[PDB]
Amino acid sequence: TVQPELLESLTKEGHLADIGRDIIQSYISNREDFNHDNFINSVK
Amino acid sequence: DINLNKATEFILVDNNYNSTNEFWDGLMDRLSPYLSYFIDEKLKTEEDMIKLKDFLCIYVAILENFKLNIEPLYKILVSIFEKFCSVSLRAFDDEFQILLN
Amino acid sequence: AFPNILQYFDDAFEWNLASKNLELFSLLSKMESSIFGNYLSDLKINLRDTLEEKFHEINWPMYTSNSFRVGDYIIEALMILIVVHSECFRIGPQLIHKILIETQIFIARYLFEAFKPYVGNLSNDGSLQIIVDLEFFQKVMGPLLEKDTEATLRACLQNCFQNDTNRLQKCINEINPIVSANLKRTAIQFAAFS
Amino acid sequence: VGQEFVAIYENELLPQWLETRSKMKLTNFKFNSPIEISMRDESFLAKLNLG
Amino acid sequence: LSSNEIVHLKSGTENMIKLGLPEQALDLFLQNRSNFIQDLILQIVDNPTNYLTQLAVIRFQTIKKTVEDFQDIFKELGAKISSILVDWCSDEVDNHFKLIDKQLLNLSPGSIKSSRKQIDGLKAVGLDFVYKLDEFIKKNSDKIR
Amino acid sequence: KFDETIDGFKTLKFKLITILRFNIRALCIYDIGSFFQNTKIWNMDVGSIELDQNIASLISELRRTESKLKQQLPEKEKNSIFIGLDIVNNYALIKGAKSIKVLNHNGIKKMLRNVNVLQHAYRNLSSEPSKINMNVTMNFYSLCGSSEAELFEYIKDNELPHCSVEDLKTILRLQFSEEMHRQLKRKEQSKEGARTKIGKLKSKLNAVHTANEK
Amino acid sequence: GTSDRHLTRKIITAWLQNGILMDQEQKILNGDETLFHEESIELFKEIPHFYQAGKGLSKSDLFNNLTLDTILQFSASVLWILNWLPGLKKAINIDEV
């Protein structure tokens, strides 16, 4: 549920690593829209 | 009485586990002691706040005789000195404006 | 190899010896002559650099205001003395620890004693007071060594001009207190030479 | 109890020494030098006293 | 080889003597005080005269305490073991001047007053080393002023 | 066994490579204490004492880093990685470090004294070798603190392996100019000595070592 | 740990040829005093041209350096491979013995 206010550390929780390693912020890349304006600013 | 280790029954790391312990209890209880020294800076008044640092910097110092005691030890007591700065600051000649009177 | 020769005279009724076989042992003698005379060379060579201390500005125009001692002549000397006797007294115990100790008191005493000559006029060049200082560092070498070494020591006590009166003798017998002051500071350093 | 023994030892005994010393050298204090010089009796703290 | 304290160090030292391995024992002990002083230097140049004064106080003060530890522990253990101590002493004094010269690389003589005062601090238990500093002055007389 | 010990050699160069990158990037990290150094001053801030605390941190963890690195590993690799990466990143650290701000004549002595301190630091790692980034970057940032265009022609006709001479010459140009460009205020300035550094941009700068273009 | 996910490991970003390749040429003796500021400033300032220093940075000093734990790790394993390569690279005893 990575919106523009709840995308970083709730995705960085304990079992929220069941979301992807670079797809934690892009955990809704499994959706139509991926993560609402720059999904991919974490792996770098 | 954690690091009395005939080491190690973990063995993880080879004498580096308690660093993670007082690390993390530094971390979680840091932000709680932050507001507990910030809110609660008013409830850390220019009285035994001197005895608060006097009962913290000794315990910041005789630590392991040190092991990773940084961010709590430096940052916290740093902000405590900022509190004694502001408290003595308004307690300074603003509180001696009777001499202005 | 002596007991290997006696037990090598077992079946072996040759005679047993014929110590012209022990020419080898004489060779060992020569090997022993090459051995310690190697190292007692270099230490003496290092003690040759002893003369870099006491010639340069020591017994010069020397007030020498009662530093008890200040004898860097004798200090660094006896230091490296106790360094060699330090690092070899365990395995080579009562080797030339003792023998090279005695020879070190010799080469010490002789290469010492021929420095007082050029300042035989006994105040050179300021040494009216440092008469008693060279008397003091002269007295420093009474740590634990032998008596003929002390004979050449007291021979070098009479070496300079005064150094001929008995006033020097009983005067240094009064100057014994500052030597006792050096005999507690410094004590524990050269206490190993006892 | 153990902590009160510890800060008892340091706060009661040790800072009394490193403020009692130095007294030879001004400041420079409460640090590596007084760590080095104190180092006295009643440094015997951490052997058994809470362990 | 691990304890920063005294009591185990004292104890297992005299237990190592109680085995009768005293020379190895002393050498390990001096190595522990070497590593000790070594790591004590790891708390900090910030600016020079302070830093030197600090440095001398650590090294010489610990050596002097180590001498009382020595005559303490090695009760009637003779001249020889003491000579090994003189080895370690002279080593560390040389290491001190090496750390002095180790930043001459750019002084004021109050530094030297600190040093010679504390070396006479070693003459409180009776060991001169001032002459090494005299030759240090001698061959290092550039920024002593 | 040659593929095997070959691969172990490859892990050796990878690992010691990683250590040298770690110390070097600790340095280039540490130079960002200048970013920001809280407005490295314009023409002065006198006084102007000391000492940019982050650089003292760099000296500190550099010193302890070499302490433990001398503890664990063997000597020759430590002298290697520390020697090359330390001196080179010191020099280019000063080089890119020149791109800062308006400049201070007292702060020339400040950052000069700091740079001399770090020269004493990497010197304290090793100085018997060619510790010349002391000389190069000291005379080069001092040459930035030098504001004589005649010296700008004179130096770099004799010295200064200063391959960033576009930005280096434009920076000492921006340093005599950085004294000029706030010599007054409004203007700050008329750029007349920078008309002499537009001409000297063509002359004291674009007579650039027979590639006369800077 | 690369698998970037989620880290700009600028050390590992600085593991890029020819800066890594000439860095192996700078690991050859290491470099044998051809410590090229060409090479060092080029590669070591190349990814670090991103700010560059600079000025006014967008750059390092706790932006993704290796921690002290990982430092003591890497120092440990490099001490291990150093102790390995003599002892285990010795016995090649030509050529199948």
CSV table of C-alpha atoms in Angstrom, one decimal, chain E residues 22-145:
chain,number,residue,atom,x,y,z
E,22,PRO,CA,58.8,-17.1,34.9
E,23,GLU,CA,60.8,-15.7,31.9
E,24,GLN,CA,58.1,-16.4,29.4
E,25,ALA,CA,55.6,-15.1,32.0
E,26,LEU,CA,57.4,-11.8,32.4
E,27,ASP,CA,57.7,-11.4,28.7
E,28,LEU,CA,54.0,-12.0,28.2
E,29,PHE,CA,53.3,-9.5,31.0
E,30,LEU,CA,55.5,-6.8,29.4
E,31,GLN,CA,53.8,-7.6,26.2
E,32,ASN,CA,50.4,-7.0,27.8
E,33,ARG,CA,51.5,-3.7,29.2
E,34,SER,CA,53.0,-2.9,25.7
E,35,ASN,CA,49.6,-3.6,24.1
E,36,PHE,CA,48.0,-1.8,27.0
E,37,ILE,CA,50.0,1.4,26.5
E,38,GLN,CA,49.7,1.0,22.8
E,39,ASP,CA,46.0,1.0,22.9
E,40,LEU,CA,45.9,3.8,25.5
E,41,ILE,CA,47.6,6.0,22.9
E,42,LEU,CA,44.5,5.4,20.7
E,43,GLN,CA,42.6,8.1,22.6
E,44,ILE,CA,43.2,11.6,21.3
E,45,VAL,CA,47.6,15.1,17.9
E,46,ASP,CA,44.9,17.6,18.5
E,47,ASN,CA,47.6,20.3,19.1
E,48,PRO,CA,51.1,19.5,20.1
E,49,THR,CA,52.2,20.3,23.6
E,50,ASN,CA,49.1,18.9,25.1
E,51,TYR,CA,49.5,15.8,23.0
E,52,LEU,CA,53.1,15.2,24.0
E,53,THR,CA,52.3,15.8,27.7
E,54,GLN,CA,49.5,13.3,27.5
E,55,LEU,CA,51.7,10.8,25.7
E,56,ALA,CA,54.6,11.0,28.2
E,57,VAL,CA,52.2,10.7,31.2
E,58,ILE,CA,50.7,7.5,29.7
E,59,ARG,CA,53.9,5.8,28.9
E,60,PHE,CA,56.2,6.6,31.8
E,61,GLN,CA,53.5,6.5,34.4
E,62,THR,CA,52.5,3.0,33.3
E,63,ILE,CA,56.1,1.9,33.2
E,64,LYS,CA,56.6,3.1,36.8
E,65,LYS,CA,53.5,1.4,38.0
E,66,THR,CA,54.8,-1.7,36.1
E,67,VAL,CA,58.0,-1.5,38.1
E,68,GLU,CA,56.0,-1.6,41.4
E,69,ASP,CA,54.1,-4.5,39.8
E,70,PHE,CA,57.4,-6.1,39.0
E,71,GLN,CA,59.1,-6.0,42.5
E,72,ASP,CA,55.6,-6.8,43.8
E,73,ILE,CA,55.2,-9.9,41.7
E,74,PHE,CA,58.8,-11.2,41.3
E,75,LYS,CA,59.6,-11.2,45.0
E,76,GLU,CA,63.2,-12.3,45.3
E,77,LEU,CA,63.4,-13.1,41.6
E,78,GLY,CA,66.8,-11.7,41.3
E,79,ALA,CA,68.8,-9.6,38.9
E,80,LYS,CA,68.2,-11.4,35.6
E,81,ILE,CA,64.4,-10.9,35.4
E,82,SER,CA,65.0,-7.3,36.4
E,83,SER,CA,67.4,-7.0,33.4
E,84,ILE,CA,64.6,-8.2,31.1
E,85,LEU,CA,62.5,-5.4,32.6
E,86,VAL,CA,65.3,-3.0,31.8
E,87,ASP,CA,65.1,-4.2,28.2
E,88,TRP,CA,61.5,-3.5,28.0
E,89,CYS,CA,61.9,-0.1,29.7
E,90,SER,CA,64.6,1.1,27.3
E,91,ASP,CA,62.6,-0.2,24.4
E,92,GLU,CA,59.6,1.9,25.3
E,93,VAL,CA,61.7,5.0,26.0
E,94,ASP,CA,63.1,4.7,22.5
E,95,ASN,CA,59.5,4.2,21.2
E,96,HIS,CA,58.6,7.4,23.0
E,97,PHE,CA,61.3,9.5,21.2
E,98,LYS,CA,60.2,7.7,18.0
E,99,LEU,CA,56.7,9.0,18.5
E,100,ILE,CA,58.1,12.5,19.3
E,101,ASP,CA,60.0,12.6,16.0
E,102,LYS,CA,57.1,10.9,14.4
E,103,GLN,CA,55.5,14.3,14.3
E,104,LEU,CA,58.4,16.7,14.1
E,105,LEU,CA,57.2,16.9,10.5
E,106,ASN,CA,56.1,20.5,9.9
E,107,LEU,CA,57.6,22.7,18.5
E,108,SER,CA,58.0,24.7,21.7
E,109,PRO,CA,60.1,23.4,24.7
E,110,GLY,CA,57.4,23.2,27.4
E,111,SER,CA,56.7,19.8,25.8
E,112,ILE,CA,60.3,18.9,26.8
E,113,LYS,CA,59.6,20.1,30.3
E,114,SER,CA,56.7,17.7,30.5
E,115,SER,CA,58.9,14.9,29.2
E,116,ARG,CA,62.0,15.4,31.4
E,117,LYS,CA,59.8,16.0,34.5
E,118,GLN,CA,58.1,12.7,34.0
E,119,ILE,CA,61.4,10.9,33.2
E,120,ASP,CA,62.6,12.1,36.6
E,121,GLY,CA,59.3,10.6,37.6
E,122,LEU,CA,61.0,7.4,36.5
E,123,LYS,CA,63.9,8.5,38.7
E,124,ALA,CA,61.5,8.3,41.6
E,125,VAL,CA,62.0,4.6,41.2
E,126,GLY,CA,65.5,5.2,40.0
E,127,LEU,CA,66.1,5.0,36.3
E,128,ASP,CA,67.8,7.7,34.3
E,129,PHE,CA,66.9,8.2,30.6
E,130,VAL,CA,67.4,12.0,30.4
E,131,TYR,CA,70.7,11.5,28.5
E,132,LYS,CA,68.8,9.9,25.6
E,133,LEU,CA,66.7,13.0,25.6
E,134,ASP,CA,69.9,15.1,25.7
E,135,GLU,CA,71.1,13.4,22.6
E,136,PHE,CA,67.6,13.8,21.2
E,137,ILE,CA,67.9,17.6,21.8
E,138,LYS,CA,71.4,17.4,20.3
E,139,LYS,CA,70.4,15.9,17.1
E,140,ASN,CA,67.0,17.4,16.9
E,141,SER,CA,67.8,21.1,17.6
E,142,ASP,CA,65.8,22.6,14.8
E,143,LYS,CA,62.3,23.3,16.1
E,144,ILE,CA,63.1,23.0,19.8
E,145,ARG,CA,63.1,26.8,20.0
